Write a protein that binds this ligand. Structure first.
Ligand SMILES: C=CCn1c(=O)c2cnc(Nc3ccc(N4CCN(C)CC4)cc3)nc2n1-c1cccc(C(C)(C)O)n1
Ligand SMILES: [Zn+2]
Length: 292
């Protein structure tokens, strides 16, 4: 049973357990608030009872050690971690506007400048991660959180990995990513190109309003990722569709690096709003010059 109040004995801090946010893996997420500073955060509470096997305990440590080394405007802030007899608690930045998945749920297909707006911040954050030699490996709508200003914050570093040397090919991804890259499925080894693939899939879902490889059978969805079986609707811009085609290639050595993306015609030749109206959560924005 999760405690009503959580206390860290090294930093001397008390966080009051509040609203249930979401359930991921073993973890339960609750909005927690510091007794003294009156600051609210997102709290990831994992039960030790489900961390008895050292393999699962090591995963949690790897996830924390990776997340704590990350400081960026487009990454979910890390404020700490602590533990007790039965639980592991992680203290992270709380984004009150939830995640792009909620936005996708209500809004489905988004306007082209809205996608250009978010994709820029998803890339900027991922650029930071790749500069620090971190592969997220599970980039999806549900872990791209939005703060009050609707700026993207990447979170959920459970499937993340640090690249220890030049040209390293990770042979094992223990876990199941949402936008799983073909090299993961075919077990040929993988590197940074798996994140560009996820970004390509995310781009498709924001512009089209459904995932590129969604089938009833997830195993038949995997067959499609392998065969490169997708079709971009013809109502989608030929510049945006050309970027999706670049990012969704079975050959990882052919996908643009996280650094070349902001320099694609899709970004450089299109309107990228400086900020989005909070109405865009509910209503599609028109982006007009003046109001009649
Ligand atoms: C702490 C675990 C990972 N995580 C974060 O780092 C994070 C940061 N901000 C947020 N914000 C947030 C706020 C509210 C809500 N909900 C409000 C209640 N609704 C019923 C559903 C949506 C939702 C989010 N939420 C955050 N996280 C979060 C919270 C719930 C579920 C999940 C997943 C599904 C990725 O495990 N992640
Ligand atoms: Zn394993």
């Amino acid at each position: 049973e999760i405690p009503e109040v959580l206390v860290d004995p090294r930093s001397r801090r008390r966080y009051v357990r509040g609203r249930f946010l979401g359930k991921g893996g073993f973890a339960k997420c609750f909005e927690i608030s510091d007794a003294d500073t009156k600051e609210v955060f997102a709290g990831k509470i994992v039960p030790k009872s489900l961390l008895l096997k050292p393999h699962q305990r090591e995963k949690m440590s790897m996830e924390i050690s990776i997340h704590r080394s990350l400081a960026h405007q487009h990454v979910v802030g890390f404020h700490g971690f602590f533990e007790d007899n039965d639980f592991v608690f992680v203290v992270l930045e709380l984004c009150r506007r939830r995640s792009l998945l909620e936005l996708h749920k209500r809004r489905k297909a988004l306007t082209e400048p809205e996608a250009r707006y978010y994709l820029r911040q998803i890339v900027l954050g991922c650029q930071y991660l790749h500069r620090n030699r971190v592969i997220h490996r599970d980039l999806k709508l549900g872990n791209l959180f939005l703060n009050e200003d609707l700026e993207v914050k990447i979170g959920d570093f459970g499937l993340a990995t640090k690249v220890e040397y030049d040209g390293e090919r990770k042979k094992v991804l223990c876990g199941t990513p949402n936008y799983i890259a073909p090299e993961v499925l075919s077990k040929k080894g993988h590197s940074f190109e798996v994140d560009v693939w996820s970004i390509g899939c995310i781009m498709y879902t924001l512009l089209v309003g459904k995932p590129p490889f969604e089938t009833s059978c997830l195993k038949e969805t995997y067959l499609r990722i392998k065969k490169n079986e997708y079709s971009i609707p013809k109502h989608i811009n030929p510049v945006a569709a050309s970027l999706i085609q670049k990012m969704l290639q079975t050959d990882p050595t052919a996908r643009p690096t996280i650094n070349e993306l902001l320099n694609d015609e899709f970004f450089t030749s299109g309107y990228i709003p400086a900020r989005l109206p909070i109405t865009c959560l509910t209503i599609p924005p028109r982006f007009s010059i003046a109001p009649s």
